[PDB]
């Protein structure tokens, strides 16, 4: 029941992700070395990862079918609201349930719950973040469902500051319809059962996470010495 267009969309998104996301994590060396001793020692290294991740998210977003039609202001707005949520979403592939930590192929790159704390984030943001990763991981979504989820997240009509709600909504719906249709046609029971609703629920979780992150960022970022550690891209994307 998948139109040729729907199959095309999946192929584009999958391609977009592969270019956007590197399984090797080879680029990580370029970030300021991780410091695990010490308040805020993790933040320089994490900021760099986040900054790097923002660039990758932006590059994925642009490839999304119909995203380019949006006005510059609508594209910028979607990304700023979206970008933290996509990083948590994308970061799921690195996240391992065994150790309960994001794993980047090396001991230094592997990130503890404490490492996140070390950046300057309280458990209230972090515990919910870990639960989210567990709950998303549990879904064991196909790569196609993972890519589509990220795309649907980015193209949200209800994002704050969106000049044209109707256009964003039209793009998203095509992605939603693709995703629903994919689960039915390409996803077998019993794992498929409720999967669309469960995925949509994750977007509600991300909104909560986003809001929390923003409050915690503002406290950390309010301090000029801590803000100084953040990258320019981070300040622009997460600040304003």
């Amino acid at each position: 029941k998948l139109s040729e267009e729907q199959q095309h969309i999946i192929a584009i998104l999958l391609d977009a992700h592969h270019k956007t996301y590197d399984p090797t994590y080879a680029d990580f060396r370029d970030f300021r070395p991780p410091v695990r001793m010490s308040p805020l020692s993790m933040l320089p290294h994490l900021a760099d990862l986040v900054s790097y991740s923002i660039q990758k998210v932006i590059g994925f977003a642009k490839m999304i079918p119909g995203f380019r039609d949006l006005t510059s202001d609508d594209q910028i707005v979607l990304l700023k609201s979206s970008a933290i949520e996509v990083i948590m979403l994308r970061s799921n592939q690195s996240f391992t349930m065994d150790d309960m930590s994001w794993d980047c192929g090396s001991q230094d790159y592997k990130y503890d719950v404490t490492d996140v704390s070390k950046a300057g984030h309280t458990l209230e943001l972090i515990e919910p973040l870990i639960k989210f990763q567990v709950g998303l991981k549990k879904l064991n979504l196909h790569e196609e469902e993972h890519v589509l989820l990220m795309a649907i997240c980015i193209v949200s009509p209800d994002r704050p500051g969106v000049q044209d709600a109707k256009l964003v909504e039209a793009i998203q719906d095509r992605l939603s319809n693709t995703l629903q249709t994919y689960i039915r046609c390409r996803h077998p029971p019993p794992g498929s059962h409720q999967l669309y609703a469960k995925m949509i629920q994750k977007l509600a979780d991300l909104r909560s996470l986003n809001e929390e992150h923003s409050k915690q960022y503002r406290s950390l970022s309010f301090q000029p010495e801590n803000s100084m550690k953040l990258t320019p891209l981070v300040l622009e994307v997460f600040g304003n």
Binding site: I58, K62, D73, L233, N240
Partner: peptide, 11 residues
């Protein structure tokens, strides 16, 4: 709206 780096990247 004062997003030079984001805007350029999207470009």
């Amino acid at each position: 709206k004062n997003h030079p780096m984001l805007m350029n990247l999207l470009k």
